[PDB]
Amino acid sequence: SEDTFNPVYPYDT
């Protein structure tokens, strides 16, 4: 998995 990139937006669930 990629590794470094958090949209920073609780998309879940």
Added chain:
Amino acid sequence: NQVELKYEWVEFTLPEGNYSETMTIDLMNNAIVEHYLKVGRQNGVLESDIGV
């Protein structure tokens, strides 16, 4: 072993229209987030130590 921390003044911009004092506050912080989603998370700073 050092930990250099950089800070730089950035002029923010809000959209035309939206009213209400509460809604304006949320937008002032929304601008702080959009700045992080273009400079912050790509360089180094985490989602934890977000200034302002």
